Design an enzyme around this catalytic site. Structure first.
Site, PDB file in Angstrom:
ATOM      1  CG  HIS A  95       1.605 -16.110  -2.835  1.00 21.20           C
ATOM      2  ND1 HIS A  95       2.505 -15.083  -2.775  1.00 21.20           N
ATOM      3  CD2 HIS A  95       1.803 -16.842  -1.729  1.00 21.20           C
ATOM      4  CE1 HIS A  95       3.255 -15.224  -1.702  1.00 21.20           C
ATOM      5  NE2 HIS A  95       2.847 -16.281  -1.050  1.00 21.20           N
ATOM      6  CB  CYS A 131       3.682  -8.194  -3.392  1.00 19.47           C
ATOM      7  SG  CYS A 131       3.215  -9.572  -4.437  1.00 19.47           S
TER       8      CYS A 131
END
Lengths: 284, 282
Positions: free
Chosen positions: A174, A275
């Site tokens: 990511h 996250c």
């Protein structure tokens, strides 16, 4: 000495956080980019509880805690299912199709918080929140295995007040696997070639130059910056027990309240600090 | 009880292995329920008093392992080894992050010159807290930490003793609600959980055990020793912590009763048996 920067509209100001408990199924069933060590689920739970305690107890955020769903082994990673900017929440369409049922309860939580909801429903669009870097003056969106150009277009259409640019992201990563904001105009960035190539691209596309904080461990470049009343700059970063040489770099932020936060178990399933929460600034 | 002193009596020990608690225990030790903040300094004082009972008061040779800040639960040495006679089973703890605790215990039990057997099977887990040795046989709780394969490896290791399993619920160990209080005497909690486990244990055994029922399950965890020139000795939770259970232990008129505080370590499920491994070197 950053306390003078406390302000209700400062970059990084938040009042609320949405988090979600991890299920027992995470240990065996959560997606992971590499085969590695066995997840200690009880230890992961304890570390998640301490992370939530920082956001709520230590920093005073109103934390909404969603219950785990054993059928959604990745559901602790709430960042991927929503991006919040000012009063608007984008409910994403995660790149991994089996994670898409996670959006339903995030949607309900954000509706309760009185946010303006926009839903990524285009069947050709995917976007993980972990691919989105909001700098305070623009967005960068990683084009990755999980986020595509159409997803970035829908993000740009949703957040009409901000420029949006894309950056290619390699392999199974990511965008924020190797970067995050460490303060106003300050990007924490890893030292790998992937991380450095990505920062170069964002710097070249932008109207203005960001300052950078370079750390030797890409994973430790993922931190959480907050501006908290009566404190100013606050940074959650990985512990010196986990990444001593990166923690030493953060130690140079002499006007930041530095908070070391362990995440050694969820790291095994690619779970980093950003996250595990969605941050919201509900102005009163 | 003093006439019961004998080098081969049930509960006779000569040595104990303990381990200091790290500062990280307060925030980072695993715990079955959210609760009060741990006072680490008070926990350390309580652990020091417990060690002082075993070594200074009762005369055991105590091996004190150093704390490791990276192993927040490392004070709970019971879970990483089971010793029977001259054989030590190094366990494979149910919590994978606790498995590095076995290294220094293994080292300590080798210096004591025990026969070492290591549970290495990647499909096996066993916490020592799930193991009740009665002097006649073993009962092993099948729990969230201990599985059938672990109990089988225990049975293959202690070949001189029968081994039977008992289901254990929730986030508990078998010895969260029982322990030996003397020869042929099982201290047992009053809850439905504890009573059902005792019933199962009694059905499977060749012979019926005597019981001592305590109203507080956690206070059924005690340490029985047979000590030279004393006989029956029992470490039990204090009347300040569990007054109704201390009253029941006060009925053991031939035991030397030693109340031991554990109020801080109880917050992370640490009971009396958890904090030592006892050894009888002939």
């Amino acid at each position: 000495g950053a306390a003078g920067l406390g302000h209700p509209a400062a970059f990084g100001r938040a009042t609320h956080a949405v988090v979600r408990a991890l299920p027992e199924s995470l240990g065996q069933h959560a997606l992971r980019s590499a085969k590695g060590e066995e997840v200690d689920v009880a230890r992961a739970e304890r570390q998640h509880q301490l992370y939530v305690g920082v956001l709520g107890s230590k920093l005073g955020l109103q934390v909404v805690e969603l219950p785990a769903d054993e059928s959604l082994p990745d559901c602790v990673f709430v960042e991927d299912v929503a991006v919040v900017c000012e009063e608007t929440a984008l409910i994403t369409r995660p790149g991994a199709p089996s994670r898409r049922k996670e959006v339903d309860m995030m949607k309900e939580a954000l509706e309760k918080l009185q946010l303006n909801i926009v839903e990524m429903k285009d069947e050709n669009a995917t976007l993980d929140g972990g691919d989105v870097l909001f700098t305070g003056r623009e967005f960068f969106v990683g084009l990755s295995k999980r986020t595509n150009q159409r997803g970035a277009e829908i993000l740009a259409d949703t957040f009409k007040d901000y420029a949006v640019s894309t950056v290619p992201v390699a392999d199974g990563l990511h965008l924020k696997s190797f970067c995050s904001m460490a303060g106003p105009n300050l990007i924490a960035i890893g030292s790998s070639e992937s991380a450095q190539k990505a920062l170069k691209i964002m710097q070249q596309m932008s109207d203005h130059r960001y300052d950078k904080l370079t750390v030797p461990d890409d994973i430790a470049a993922n931190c959480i910056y907050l501006n908290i009343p009566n404190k100013g700059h606050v940074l959650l970063h990985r512990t010196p027990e986990e990444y001593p040489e990166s923690a030493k770099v953060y130690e140079k932020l002499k006007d930041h309240m530095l908070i070391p936060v362990s995440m050694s178990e969820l790291e095994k399933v690619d779970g980093l600090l950003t996250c595990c929460s969605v941050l919201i600034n509900k102005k009163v």
